[PDB]
C-alpha cells in the first residue's frame, strides 16, 4: 500500500492555511468500517508525533488549527493559521492493511522576509596545523531564504573541489537557516598562500560580501 | 509520565548482529503492543516489527524476516529487537513505538538510536576549537569542528548543556576520504569573551570518544 504526499514541500506564511494530501494505492478501509489513517509530524531532532488519526480524530493535546478528513483513496490534512513551531516533515500513515506503511513526508516551511547572512571566517586552528592539515570555516548565520552560494578564494583564485556545506533544518525561533561552508587544504598548501577569503551571494545583499583575513 | 529510552545503537559488520534496547517507564508496559519503526539515512519511515501484548504473535516486514526477532522482558518493561545477518540496508535510526490498539496509533515513541552496518572500522574524530575574532563579529561568533571521523552521530554540547540559545550543530558532511566531519557554532556578546567561559562537549561512542574543547580568543 503505497502513500503519496504532496506537495513535497509546502512554503507558507505565518497565519496563513496549508493543506497536505496523502493517496494510497488501494483502498485504507479495513474490514471493520474504521480507516486507519494517521497524520504524523517530525520537528528537526525530534521523534514524530502523532497528530491525527482515524482520518479526523485529533490526538490528545493537538491543537484545534489541524484537520484531517478524506475517503477510502484521498486524505487531506489541513493546517490554519499555520505558526513557526508547527514546521517539519508532516507524514502520513496507514496501518489499515498489513505491513502498515508511512508516505515519504512533507516539509513544511515557513515564509518570511528576506534576511542577509552574518557572515563569519575562522582560520585553521594552530593544534590542526600540527597534525598536518588547515581547514577554514566560512559561517553564514540566521539568513532567509535557505539558498546561498559560497565562493572560496585563496590569493583571489576560485577554489574548487576542495570545500563541503551543510546547511540546518529551518529555525522556530525566526524561521531562518545557517550554513557552515569548509576548506580543508594541506598544511603545505596552506602556508604558501597569503589571502583566505570566503565571497557570500544572497539575495539579501544588493552585492556580494567578503570576509576575509591574512595569514 | 509515560516514556520510552532507547539503547544498544553502534556500528556492525555486515552479515554480524546486534540487540536494541527500549527501557519504558510510566505505563502499563505488559498490556499493550509495541514496535520497532527505522527511518532511514533518505528519511523514509518503515515499520519494522511488532510484538502483541500477550508476547504471543509476532510480525515482521519481509525486508527483516528471518532476521531480525522482537521480544519483551514483562518483569523489568524493556522492548528489544534482535538483528542477526544485517546488511547495509539496515543502517538507520531505530525507534521504539507504543502502538495503542483502539484507533491501532503510535502514540509514545523513543528518541532513537542509530545502526550503522558497514565493513570499516570506527574512527574518533579530532575536535579543533574555532576562536572568536575580529574576523567572527555587538555579537561575536565561536565554535567546534569535529573532523574526520565514523560512523555517526556525534553529539555537541555547549557548557554542558548550559548553553543552548544561538547554537547551531550542522548535519555531518562527508568528506572525499568517506569520513564526516561536522560544526557546532554559537553567537554571544563579545563583551562577554573577556569574562565568560565557553567549552564544547563532545561525544563519539563508537569510539569512546569523549572531549571537552575550551575555546578562547
Known amino acids: 500500500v503505497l502513500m503519496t504526499q504532496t506537495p513535497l514541500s509546502l512554503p507558507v506564511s505565518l497565519g496563513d492555511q496549508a493543506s497536505i494530501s496523502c493517496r494510497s494505492s488501494?483502498?485504507?478501509?479495513?474490514?471493520?468500517?474504521?480507516?486507519?489513517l494517521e497524520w504524523y509530524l517530525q520537528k528537526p531532532g525530534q521523534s514524530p508525533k502523532l497528530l491525527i488519526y482515524?482520518?479526523?480524530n485529533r490526538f490528545s493535546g493537538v491543537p484545534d488549527r489541524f484537520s484531517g478528513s478524506g475517503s477510502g483513496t484521498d486524505f487531506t490534512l489541513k493546517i490554519s493559521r499555520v505558526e513557526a513551531e508547527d514546521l517539519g516533515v508532516y507524514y502520513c500513515?496507514?496501518?489499515?492493511?498489513?505491513?502498515?506503511?508511512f508516505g515519504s513526508g512533507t516539509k513544511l516551511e515557513i515564509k518570511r522576509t528576506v534576511a542577509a547572512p552574518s557572515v563569519f571566517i575562522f582560520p585553521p586552528s594552530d593544534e590542526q596545523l600540527k597534525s598536518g592539515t588547515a581547514s577554514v570555516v566560512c559561517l553564514l548565520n540566521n539568513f532567509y531564504p535557505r539558498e546561498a552560494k559560497v565562493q572560496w578564494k585563496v590569493d583571489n583564485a576560485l577554489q574548487s573541489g576542495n570545500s563541503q556545506e551543510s546547511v540546518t533544518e529551518q529555525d522556530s525561533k525566526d524561521s531562518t537557516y545557517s550554513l557552515s561552508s569548509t576548506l580543508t587544504l594541506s598544511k603545505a598548501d596552506y602556508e604558501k598562500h597569503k589571502v583566505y577569503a570566503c565571497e557570500v551571494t544572497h539575495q539579501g545583499l544588493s552585492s556580494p560580501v567578503t570576509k576575509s583575513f591574512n595569514r | 509520565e509515560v516514556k520510552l529510552v532507547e539503547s544498544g545503537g553502534g556500528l556492525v559488520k555486515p552479515g554480524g548482529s546486534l540487540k536494541l534496547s527500549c527501557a519504558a517507564s510510566?505505563?502499563?508496559?505488559?498490556?499493550?503492543?509495541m514496535s520497532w519503526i527505522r527511518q532511514t539515512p533518505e528519511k523514509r519511515l518503515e515499520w519494522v516489527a511488532t510484538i502483541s501484548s500477550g508476547g504471543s504473535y509476532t510480525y515482521y516486514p519481509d525486508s527483516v524476516k528471518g532476521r531480525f526477532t522482537i521480544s519483551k522482558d514483562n518483569a523489568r518493561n524493556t522492548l528489544y529487537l534482535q538483528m542477526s545477518s544485517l546488511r547495509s540496508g539496515d543502517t538507520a535510526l531505530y525507534y521504539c513505538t507504543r502502538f495503542r490498539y483502539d484507533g491501532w496509533y503510535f502514540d509514545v515513541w523513543g528518541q532513537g538510536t542509530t545502526v550503522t552496518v558497514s565493513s570499516a572500522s570506527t574512527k574518533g574524530p579530532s575536535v579543533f576549537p574555532l576562536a572568536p575574532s575580529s574576523k567572527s563579529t555587538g555579537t561575536a561568533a565561536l565554535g567546534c569542528l569535529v573532523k574526520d571521523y565514523f560512523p555517526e552521530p556525534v553529539t555537541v554540547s555547549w557548557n554542558s548543556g548550559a548553553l543552548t540559545s544561538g547554537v547551531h550543530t550542522f548535519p555531518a558532511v562527508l568528506q572525499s576520504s568517506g569520513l564526516y566531519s561536522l560544526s557546532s557554532v554559537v553567537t554571544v556578546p563579545s563583551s562577554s569573551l573577556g569574562t565568560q567561559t565557553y567549552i564544547c562537549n563532545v561525544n563519539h561512542k563508537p569510539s569512546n570518544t569523549k572531549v571537552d574543547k575550551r575555546v578562547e580568543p
Open positions: 482515524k482520518v479526523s
Open positions: 510510566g505505563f502499563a508496559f505488559s498490556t499493550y503492543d
Open positions: 488501494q483502498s485504507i478501509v479495513h474490514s471493520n468500517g474504521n480507516t486507519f
Open positions: 500513515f496507514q496501518a489499515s492493511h498489513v505491513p502498515p506503511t
